[PDB]
Design a protein around this ligand. Structure first.
Ligand SMILES: Nc1nc2c(ncn2[C@@H]2O[C@H](COP(=O)(O)OP(=O)(O)O)[C@@H](O)[C@H]2O)c(=O)[nH]1
Ligand SMILES: Nc1nc2c(ncn2[C@@H]2O[C@H](COP(=O)(O)OP(=O)(O)O)[C@@H](O)[C@H]2O)c(=O)[nH]1
Lengths: 160, 33, 37, 174
């Protein structure tokens, strides 16, 4: 089985693709359509087996033990990005101080309908010590790269 | 009626899952030594 | 009305399965840890 | 604090024998005089000391099984101990012990530690199940045996500490 087990939570406004980011990473599925659930996926990092349980959508229990967080917005819906500030505060208030956070701009496949400039998003991320990457759960772009990125940053940290 | 009890129980179980995860996570880190 | 109660139980059931799987793994971890230090 | 071992122990038997109260008496020192509220079945924890090692017990009530029948496996999964509970003043609950035992054989590990428990010892003036007969049954089926009273809090601590110790002694001899 696994060597490590990391809890990673997905936060962000409804409809940004959190559920689809989870389904594509854990079972390579995308759809077009509650309570609290999670799914697991194992990857290799430094010869070690890292099992990630990714959580989607009690607020204190949700963040409890979370070592990673993907703050997700919609690059075609600027409203979802304006609310990133609110989600970040919920993280800072209800989670660990050493949690690894990545700002994820989903639906990169809608570049022609982009409402959030990537330079502006990265500027926000860099100032707030957040990782940043644009993804597309639809056509599977940077999804593996996103999760593998955050799971590696977490791993290197706990390797102390 | 007895649906409010179910909501609280779902909440309690999530906390339990979180605690279990946390401890597993901690134990694994210790095991690599 | 009735659909909420049935939907809740399914969620309750699935979380219980999760708990049992975690506990079993946590049991095994503690045992093999005590076999060391 | 933390612990050195986590052991899962399940409570098994007919409804009304006192499973919920054995659990509440051991984990919280609380007792309910009335009939328990049946919902999504639950569990509780308590830590005791065995040979210096902190042993945390995750104790389950398995009543709602066969109402959450799809997840029956979850109740027995990882269970290293089992309390087979009956009512000493209700012979019917004692007959059904052989039934719950076959249930245990299928759903649980072949080498799970089983203790036969006669609860409501405080109702000895209405004893329907003689101790000698019950103890002999436990001997015939390789079961541990104790009589308890969740109400009077008699042998409750001992019952759990016995099975947890036995479990620990087994995994430590590995
Ligand atoms: N074009 C595009 N649509 C997406 C992407 N990810 C999710 N969606 C769509 O967004 C809608 C809602 O996404 P959902 O999974 O419910 O996000 P959540 O509510 O935040 O968890 C779905 O109909 C998806 O088809 C993506 O990468 N590209
Ligand atoms: N006299 C006496 N009554 C008990 C004892 N343990 C439980 N009861 C009562 O038996 C009834 C049913 O017990 P319960 O805990 O619900 O059993 P369960 O359905 O198997 O979990 C309750 O009214 C309890 O108060 C005991 O040790 N002595």
């Amino acid at each position: 089985s696994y060597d490590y087990l990391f809890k990673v939570v997905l936060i962000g406004d409804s409809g940004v693709g959190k559920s689809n980011l989870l389904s594509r990473f854990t079972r390579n599925e995308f759809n077009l359509e509650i309570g609290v659930e999670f799914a697991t996926r194992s990857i290799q990092v430094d010869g070690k087996t890292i099992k990630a349980q990714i959580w989607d959508t009690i607020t204190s229990a949700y963040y409890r033990g979370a070592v990673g967080a993907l703050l997700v917005y919609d690059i075609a819906k600027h409203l979802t990005y304006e609310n990133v500030e609110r989600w970040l505060k919920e993280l800072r208030d209800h989670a660990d101080s050493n949690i690894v956070i990545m700002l994820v701009g989903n639906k990169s496949d809608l570049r022609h309908l982009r409402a959030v400039p990537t330079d502006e998003a990265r500027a926000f991320a860099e100032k707030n010590n957040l990782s940043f990457i644009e993804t597309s759960a639809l056509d599977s772009t940077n999804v593996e790269e996103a999760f593998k990125n955050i799971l590696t940053e977490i791993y290197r940290i706990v390797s102390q | 009626y007895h649906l409010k009890e179910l909501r609280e129980q779902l909440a309690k179980q999530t906390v339990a899952i979180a605690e279990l995860t946390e401890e597993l996570q901690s134990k694994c880190i210790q095991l690599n030594k």
